[PDB]
Curated annotation (Swiss-Prot), chain A:
Its main location: mitochondrion. Component of the mitochondrial large ribosomal subunit (mt-LSU). Mature mammalian 55S mitochondrial ribosomes consist of a small (28S) and a large (39S) subunit. The 28S small subunit contains a 12S ribosomal RNA (12S mt-rRNA) and 30 different proteins. The 39S large subunit contains a 16S rRNA (16S mt-rRNA), a copy of mitochondrial valine transfer RNA (mt-tRNA(Val)), which plays an integral structural role, and 52 different proteins. One of its GO terms (molecular function) is translation release factor activity. Its EC number is 3.1.1.29. It is found in: Mitochondrion. This is Large ribosomal subunit protein mL62.
Curated annotation (Swiss-Prot), chain C:
The gene is MRPL15. Pfam families: Ribosomal_L27A. Component of the mitochondrial large ribosomal subunit (mt-LSU). Mature mammalian 55S mitochondrial ribosomes consist of a small (28S) and a large (39S) subunit. The 28S small subunit contains a 12S ribosomal RNA (12S mt-rRNA) and 30 different proteins. The 39S large subunit contains a 16S rRNA (16S mt-rRNA), a copy of mitochondrial valine transfer RNA (mt-tRNA(Val)), which plays an integral structural role, and 52 different proteins. Residues 31-47 have a biased composition (Basic residues). Disulfide bonds: none annotated. GO terms for biological process: cellular response to leukemia inhibitory factor; mitochondrial translation. This is Large ribosomal subunit protein uL15m. It comes from Homo sapiens. Residues 17-61 are annotated as: Disordered. GO terms for cellular component: mitochondrial inner membrane; mitochondrial large ribosomal subunit; mitochondrion. It comes from the Eukaryota. The keyword Ribosomal protein applies.
Curated annotation (Swiss-Prot), chain D:
The chain holds residues 327 to 380 of 380 of the full protein. It is found in: Mitochondrion. Belongs to the phosphatidylethanolamine-binding protein family. Mitochondrion-specific ribosomal protein mL38 subfamily. This is Large ribosomal subunit protein mL38. Component of the mitochondrial large ribosomal subunit (mt-LSU). Mature mammalian 55S mitochondrial ribosomes consist of a small (28S) and a large (39S) subunit. The 28S small subunit contains a 12S ribosomal RNA (12S mt-rRNA) and 30 different proteins. The 39S large subunit contains a 16S rRNA (16S mt-rRNA), a copy of mitochondrial valine transfer RNA (mt-tRNA(Val)), which plays an integral structural role, and 52 different proteins. mL38 is located at the central protuberance.
Curated annotation (Swiss-Prot), chain E:
GO terms for molecular function: structural constituent of ribosome. GO terms for biological process: mitochondrial translation; translation. It is found in: Mitochondrion. The keyword Mitochondrion applies. It comes from Homo sapiens. This is Large ribosomal subunit protein bL35m. Keywords: Mitochondrion, Ribonucleoprotein, Ribosomal protein, Transit peptide. Belongs to the bacterial ribosomal protein bL35 family. The keyword Endoplasmic reticulum does not apply. Its main location: mitochondrion. Component of the mitochondrial large ribosomal subunit (mt-LSU). Mature mammalian 55S mitochondrial ribosomes consist of a small (28S) and a large (39S) subunit. The 28S small subunit contains a 12S ribosomal RNA (12S mt-rRNA) and 30 different proteins. The 39S large subunit contains a 16S rRNA (16S mt-rRNA), a copy of mitochondrial valine transfer RNA (mt-tRNA(Val)), which plays an integral structural role, and 52 different proteins. GO terms for cellular component: mitochondrial inner membrane; mitochondrial large ribosomal subunit; mitochondrial ribosome; mitochondrion.
Amino acid sequence: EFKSIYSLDKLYPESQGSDTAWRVPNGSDIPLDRLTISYCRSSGNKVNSKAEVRFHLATAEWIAEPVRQKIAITHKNKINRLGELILTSESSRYQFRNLADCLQKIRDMITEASQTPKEPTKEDVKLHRIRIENMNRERLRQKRIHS
Amino acid sequence: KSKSKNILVRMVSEAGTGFCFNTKRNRLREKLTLLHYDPVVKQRVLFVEKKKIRSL
Amino acid sequence: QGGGARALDLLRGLPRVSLANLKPNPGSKKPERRPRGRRRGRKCGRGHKGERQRGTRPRLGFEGGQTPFYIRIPKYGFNEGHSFRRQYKPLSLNRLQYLIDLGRVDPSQPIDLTQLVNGRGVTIQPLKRDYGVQLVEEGADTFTAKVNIEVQLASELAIAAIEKNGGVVTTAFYDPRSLDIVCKPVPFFLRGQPIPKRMLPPEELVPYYTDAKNRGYLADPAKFPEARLELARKYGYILPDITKDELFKMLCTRKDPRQIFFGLAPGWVVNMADKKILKPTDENLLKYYTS
Amino acid sequence: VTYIFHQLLDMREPVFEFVRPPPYHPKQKRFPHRQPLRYLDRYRDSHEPTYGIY
Amino acid sequence: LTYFSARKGKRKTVKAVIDRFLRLHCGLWVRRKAGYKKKLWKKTPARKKRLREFVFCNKTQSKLLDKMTTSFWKRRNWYVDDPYQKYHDRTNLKV
RNA sequence: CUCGGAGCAGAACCCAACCUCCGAGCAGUACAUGCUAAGACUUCACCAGUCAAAGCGAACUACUAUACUCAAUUGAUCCAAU
RNA sequence: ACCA
């Protein structure tokens, strides 16, 4: 076989060998077997497809127990009757890129839960209406006649 | 042509962003210092007049 | 069963087809219009005086003196340097898969420009500043073939589709001369020139081809295991072990960076007439072609 | 309310969204004279590059 | 225009057009607006923003710019990272 | 000899005259007179010109405000200066 | 100073 002064053997002397580029590094965070991936063609007006990743948050063991508790709270509305956490992405016409977004959401829920940010976020507009509506509901709260 | 009251002057951001803008001021007035929005730093900062662009 | 045979048997009972009873297909021979007779003569379609009847109206774009439309728009570099921009014929994973399914590209062997051109999968125009093929992702969901393919540019999702099926993809640079040769080897061999060396990328392209994330052909092989692992995590497939595959030797075949063809070295003369290959042995020549 | 739907009523919790009508656009012209370049984005369906036959 | 060159017998491109207009493969032509760099101090921000748009030509101008350029300028190109790449083909266009 | 207002041209729009009249080739306030974007108008073409929801940034509790008062108050391309 |  021909070899020039720019053989990868010469350019990277320490990286020689036929397997160097193809070894599987020994040193398993999100186990794909533990997830149920499903693909629908949402409205296909939509060219974009739809991926759905659902896993039972309680049974999940690859997620730290404390995180599983915290996630169950901050994402109550994504937990169905059976206890499955359901994530859906339909922002791409490729199932690869929709699943990648689904997995990145799972990967984000965990990171967010473990960090526990205490920074005071800027109040959203829709929240202001609720705060006032909430403030004037504990203003009509009475007491017991005979305490 | 001979008559002239206002002049066009360049106002450079004091924020060091290099952002500039043009405004008119009376020729006899003193050099302008203004508080103007600088998009690069995304906040209002001081601008100082540097050069007269032209006479209006 | 019908009209087809009904025409040949209908021909048996007709006069012989000769040079005396032929005619063009109706609608194929529009008639000529000549300025003769009442309808078409006299002023002959040219109107009356002015510049138009006399054949002297101004050039195209002139508007009668008003500063013309195409001149009063400001110059803007929409097309500045168009002639030095590199172009890449896109190859889709739909089109690649189709070529393999129809037998026009052979996945059992390495696939480079020569195999795509010879399978008539892409048409490369180096004179129109083509720099090779860009592997584009269209069709990634349904792509199943495992290939060892060499392109010039590749999308991450296209790479993921190749590597999810157990295949290999590398991005390699071809200078315009090397590209012309790799695309049509036979015409180059009919020039009787020694096979030239494949040049290096220009600086602006050296980072692309020394980067493992692009599977660049000048990239560090030791950094490929990680980059292949990242896309598998990103896109949610398990990276196969290709060392375990029987075609692993084939999947590893890569040209030397200075090499245009698999199995042929710079400085060789291909003698297609006698089916021989002439190799120089002079030291100065041999040093030139290996450098 | 989830507890009522799940336990007392023994059903799935129905979720609704406030959906607004799709935005109006005039019929696309072959030559959109003097419209900005993004006029084409108003009639596009996907953001990802297409390639046709290639 | 040069309909027949003295050297090649070929029609020539008017290079004034190449320096001012962009041809999309679909047959649309894109221009800048006249006066977008002139006397900005006296133009309102709404007017200044209108002057910064890239706009399409009408059919008459398109037909004219097609005639002043040769076939080379109508070929499909595959420039890498072309800012206008997505604008070369039409979508959902009826009649 | 360009641009605005009025009559001719009474009521959607348009409408000539070496027709009848009157004006403009600026001033003033700002310094978010920042960004961006649906949908529209249009001086009978084009060029140019015009209005604007939502959004982002700001500002903010009693006509103002994501598009100042004002009728015109104006000059394309190339090129030059930076 | 005063090219377009």
